RNA sequence: AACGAGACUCUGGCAUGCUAACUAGUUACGCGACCCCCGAGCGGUCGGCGUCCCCCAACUUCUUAGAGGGACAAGUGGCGU
């Protein structure tokens, strides 16, 4: 994006200023809608070790990563419910802004009484970022492996690949009774990601109505007629030794929570977003996969090192999470935008500097 | 034009493939020895995912197993061991027919006659043996032998006539005829322990090699020095071509084919070129193998593997 | 067609010769049955391979084993060596590889000397104390 | 004190120290900051990448 | 731990690489049974022990020149 | 559970560690769940070793002390059957998570050692491995149901699941609680 | 250059390889006898339980004791001139 010359500015919400804005005894969600399908676990990936190591499929789906205005649910709902609107991925940024260190950018394209909180097509905004929270993250240029954006390259790459590779594509799959409305039920293949999509309800005081896209990406079986929903993310890595990290290959089993901790330095921006997204969902376990370049000279080559099942909610007991300083946060950016008149408006972060702001734009700008 | 793709890799063993062999009228199985002292009968899928599985393991050794080989019937087979004994396998289920019982050290180098009645051995006992079927002793060779380990004895196919090759550490080749057991020729070249010889599929000629790693050849009826040619630093195993004349050289880096009419290199196998040092980065060669199709070989190395390639055109 | 591979297992001088002999189920020890073999209280232990792997492997065989040596204790840990590697053999012999290679991951992953043993046996005392290594008490005065 | 509860992780292990090599050097990263290091004395037998419980990281360690 | 290796392999161990130099593979089981059959070692344990560093001294000859 | 071994009837699923600090030294679940505790006797041989046995099978081994009750480690597991069934019946839980409790409420922060100077009694403050916590830990609340049922009419299981509720939530009628506190308020002092 | 150290001797740990056994066993039947239908069936038979019967049976895994092989820092990754 290019700030421009002619958009005002009205207020910087710093992160200190956020960070202490809160709200507080936030009700159950009712669902809306869900869509979609979801397919079942393998139960052998249970019992994975270093020694007896299982490389990477690289598993092509066709994602939908579509945008608020150009969801039709989104879009239909907005004249039954609501007067907030996102996807989930918009409000994992929101969540964990105070962490960023990197630009992202947001058009609240502003109608009416209500706002559509519109992510760019044009935007890199859902890419994950790879030793970004570090000492001195890479500063190679973009003809290089190693540099900022060939490793969320290589990131993004390889976090939803290995999303299918957990599950079973040709084994039965538990089905919503509405399907996805993001491609048709011509596509006969089974070559669409196992997802669903969660339309879910929230208030936030205020007279406000959130109604945004959530979403799982695997069921595993459980027992007694139970099952299991998971958010499924993986963890890749280039090298230990240019980030001042772990060799997780030497330290696995060992240093289980050290290697952990590595991440919460490097990269605890996408930590917590992963937790965020994991917690609007409210899965029952957060699965992570354990993933490294197969040569750390070749960026395309990858390997599975192990997976291990966590809970979302005792985790974010853990990891120093907690969700009311987030919806206070959501809360004061919904202060700007209402008072003010329907626009494209444009919140941002600064590219070398830590601060969010909201831009009022001459609009299709 | 006729050059050499990488067709797959095989996996199933913790020991270094010593020998691999073929018979012709299978060529869906195929056998392995390896220096985990047993020898592996596989089951090959075509399927590229893999390239085959170990059907059964045949089992029952106290040291390695050198070389092995296939029965004209394909429904026997031999191998010759470091603990001084052979077998005899039965290839059904396992089931060793007999155990030959009599040398005072290793046996390393074994063969098996085209009419199943003759059978012969190398041993760093410095003694060429013959061993009929029955595992016993027709004849054993003590006079006018190596002075030096015996690396590998070979049956020649010939119009009828008995010969059988022997070429030992000594640095000579030597040529036998049966019926008198005499000195057919005393061929002297290579400096530097001879480490293998074969016979071509007509049978008049013996290329040989060794820790020169030179390839001269020599006639074997004719008696006459034809020529040499540099095949790199060392030579461990050679097999000529059942539908061509071609030859296989198997280096440590890389396996040399080499047409012969004319004489030149036509490509060098190179295999994974993954990122080690500095003594042997790649495993050495050691054995090779023509399936009777000629469109595969395969290739025994020190990390465990059977490696294979096909002839693309 | 008779089929029958023995196998053992050890564990300070216990031996189990665990034949497996073609059949169907009815795994016994001294001919008795597994379920009253007694402490009772490490029933779950000698169990534990047929249990995980199920009964279904365990299908194709009549298995009984006699036993010799060690205390009440190390007697368990024999008879749980020599069934694992009993069932093993015969899928070694008379089945392909890859059926026993999958058996062999299984096992050997949560390993407590099921496919191995232990070299540790009790060590030659020497004189000055009641013990290998305990000496008996000096005094100074 | 008044400080809340600290979690701080090894990088490196420097060598033993007390008068029975009952002490042990080791340097620690401060876990919520990549370029803050202290050096301190912990009593335990530690490896590498492992992670302690401050009650403060006022105090800094300098000799046995 | 500890292990390091006596004179008395040293010694002999340069004498059996230079006059039997050809001989050599870089093998250990290979370098075993030549030492075992150009000399006697009387005992088994020994025997074990020159092999590996006729086997150790043969991989460095083959780089620059050793001065011993 | 078909593929993973409960307790002989006690998930380790649905079991947790709330720390970062104490995980990769506590485990349970990751396939290190067994019918039973016990071993074939390797436990230690490298330092790195120890860490790597069960929670579960450390505490039936630091239960059995002080001459009379040595090598009896059958009798030992008696006694832990019962622990678990009295304290799922008496609070009802997943009675692991009573014990994960147990264990890192009675862990130290900061502990203290000696330092010669003078030729006089100076103390100096240090900090404490997650290994050394855990260690601590196991010792502290099995010296409790060891003392209590010294002369009491009570048996050991159940006083040892009394010592585990006590500790699990803090109350300070247990044995551990106490004696954790007492070091950190040394350790405040001279420091 | 020599003595001590080491080397050496004994012992433990690895062999379904080798050698051979009614003063050592196992397996296999031949079995006939006892036992209970305990399971399919009926009690027989098939299966299960030990003992007698065992051979001019087969074998040496278990037991026994001899000859041999195996481990060398051997291979790989760090570090050291």
Known sequence: VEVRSDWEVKEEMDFPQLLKMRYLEVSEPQDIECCGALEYYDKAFDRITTRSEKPLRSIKRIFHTVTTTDDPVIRKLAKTQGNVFATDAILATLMSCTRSVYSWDIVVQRVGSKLFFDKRDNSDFDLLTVSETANEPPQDEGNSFNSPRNLAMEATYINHNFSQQCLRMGKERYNFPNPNPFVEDDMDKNEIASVAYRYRRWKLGDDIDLIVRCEHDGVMTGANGEVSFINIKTLNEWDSRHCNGVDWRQKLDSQRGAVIATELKNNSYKLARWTCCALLAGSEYLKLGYVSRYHVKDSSRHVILGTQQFKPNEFASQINLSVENAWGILRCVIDICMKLEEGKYLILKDPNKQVIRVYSLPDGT | TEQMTLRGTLKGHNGWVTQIATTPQFPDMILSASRDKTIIMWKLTRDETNYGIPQRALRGHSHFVSDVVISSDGQFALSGSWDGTLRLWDLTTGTTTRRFVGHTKDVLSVAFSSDNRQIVSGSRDKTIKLWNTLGVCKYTVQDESHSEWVSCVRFSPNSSNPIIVSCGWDKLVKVWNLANCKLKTNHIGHTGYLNTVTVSPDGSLCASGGKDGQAMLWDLNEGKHLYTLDGGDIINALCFSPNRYWLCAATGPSIKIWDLEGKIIVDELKQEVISTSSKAEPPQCTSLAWSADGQTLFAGYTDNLVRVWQVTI | PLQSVQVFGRKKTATAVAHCKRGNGLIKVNGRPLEMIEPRTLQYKLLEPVLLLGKERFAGVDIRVRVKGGGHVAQIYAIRQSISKALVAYYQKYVDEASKKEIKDILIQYDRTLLVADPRRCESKKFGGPGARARYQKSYR | RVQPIKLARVTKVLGRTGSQGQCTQVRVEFMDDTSRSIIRNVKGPVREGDVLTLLESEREARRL | ?68 | TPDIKLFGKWSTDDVQINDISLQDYIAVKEKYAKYLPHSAGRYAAKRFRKAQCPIVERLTNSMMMHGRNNGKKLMTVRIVKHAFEIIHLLTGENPLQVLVNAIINSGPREDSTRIGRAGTVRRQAVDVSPLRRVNQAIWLLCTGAREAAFRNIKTIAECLADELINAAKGSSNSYAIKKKDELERVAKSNR
């Open chain 5, 1 to 68: 731990m500890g292990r390091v290796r006596t004179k008395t392999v040293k010694k002999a161990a340069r004498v059996i690489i230079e006059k039997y130099y050809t001989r050599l593979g870089n093998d250990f089981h290979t370098n075993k049974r030549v030492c075992e059959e150009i000399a006697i070692i009387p005992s088994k344990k020994l025997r074990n022990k020159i092999a590996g560093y006729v086997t150790h001294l043969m991989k460095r000859i083959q780089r620059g020149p050793v001065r011993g």
